[PDB]
Amino acid sequence: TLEEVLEAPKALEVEVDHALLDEKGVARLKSLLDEHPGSLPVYLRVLGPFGEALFALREVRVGEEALGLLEAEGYRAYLVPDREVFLQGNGGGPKEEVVPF
Amino acid sequence: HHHHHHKAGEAQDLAEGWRAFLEALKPTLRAFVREARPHLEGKTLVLRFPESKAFHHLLPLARAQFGVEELAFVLEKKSLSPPWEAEEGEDPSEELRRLARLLGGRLLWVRKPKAPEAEEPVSEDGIGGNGIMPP
Amino acid sequence: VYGIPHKKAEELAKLIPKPLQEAELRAEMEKDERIRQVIEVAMRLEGLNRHASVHAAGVVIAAEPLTDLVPLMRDQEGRPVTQYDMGAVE
Numbered sequence: 001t002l003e004e005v006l007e008a009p010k011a012l013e014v015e016v017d018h019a020l021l022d023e024k025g026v027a028r029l030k031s032l033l034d035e036h037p038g039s040l041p042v043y044l045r046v047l048g049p050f051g052e053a054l055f056a057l058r059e060v061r062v063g064e065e066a067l068g069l070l071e072a073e074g075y076r077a078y079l080v081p082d083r084e085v086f087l088q089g090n091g092g093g094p095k096e097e098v099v100p101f
Numbered sequence: 102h103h104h105h106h107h108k109a110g111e112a113q114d115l116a117e118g119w120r121a122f123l124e125a126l127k128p129t130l131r132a133f134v135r136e137a138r139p140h141l142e143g144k145t146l147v148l149r150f151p152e153s154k155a156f157h158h159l160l161p162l163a164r165a166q167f168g169v170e171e172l173a174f175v176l177e178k179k180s181l182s183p184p185w186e187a188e189e190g191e192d193p194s195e196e197l198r199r200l201a202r203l204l205g206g207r208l209l210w211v212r213k214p215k216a217p218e219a220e221e222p223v224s225e226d227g228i229g230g231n232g233i234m235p236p
Numbered sequence: 237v238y239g240i241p242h243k244k245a246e247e248l249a250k251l252i253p254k255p256l257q258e259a260e261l262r263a264e265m266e267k268d269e270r271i272r273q274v275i276e277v278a279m280r281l282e283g284l285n286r287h288a289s290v291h292a293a294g295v296v297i298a299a300e301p302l303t304d305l306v307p308l309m310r311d312q313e314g315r316p317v318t319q320y321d322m323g324a325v326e
Contacts, residue, residue, distance in 0.1 A: 006227055072266055100226045 004097035011082035012062045013043035014075050032070065038063020041082055056083075105136065120177050124168035138163040182208060184229040185215055197232040248274075256282055290317050296325055 020026060033042065042057035070077045104116065117132035127134060142159045143150025151162055174181060182205075187196050192207035199207075218225055242249070248271070251261045256279035265272055290311050296318055302308060306325065309317040318325060
């Protein structure tokens, strides 16, 4: 349910456009993700020429400060629910996710 | 009268108060005074309509009366008008939020039950618990 | 100084209401690193002359010779111009 999603640990998601060359080489995105370590999986929505792609990042885990400081630049970040979390029936749990509703 | 329709119960009882042009509750009135003004004018123009009331005796015809003096309210926004807020509580907020509008949500709030949510769903508990999670 | 691309310049120019000392849309400065210096240099070159010149109606009639108390110039069209301005002459 909605409250089960909203409580489950959230993750950072940036939505970058197609317009970005590879042989600069795209180190700008990698440099700005380095400075803010933590524990949030970074997702990338690349609106390509045909089909909306889904790209979870690599090693970098954000610390929930890099959302606002990234929106300062020409990127549209979000604090979306983490996809990988959706499973199991403990830790939260499903009882505790009914409490906020 | 389009505003007078939008009327969501007690919604417009404050709306008439907030963008005003009244006279300290306004003698012999009423709220709105902007109900009478278009009756005086008689929309759209219309020559055989705004004369009627002036002959017996929109905005300029309304300013031509009128119970002006007072000067209260302005917008359209202005005002007047375990975890919780908190700390304490003003507003401005002293724990969470806001990059307001959010400010405004803490002033209608007090007091003093938590949750709920009301109206209803559903993020005032989450933002609260999330704000407690960073000690 | 000639009229070349005023593409982003006209956009930056239209943000001004006034001097750059007050000018409130400064959020444009944090975006790019190039335009930080453009503004900062511009406001450093703001009040500077900028040259000139003569006054449409300005005429002085001194009792003793002007050259004793006020220094002089001569413009392009051959007018004896005062080096001080309105306020300084008065």
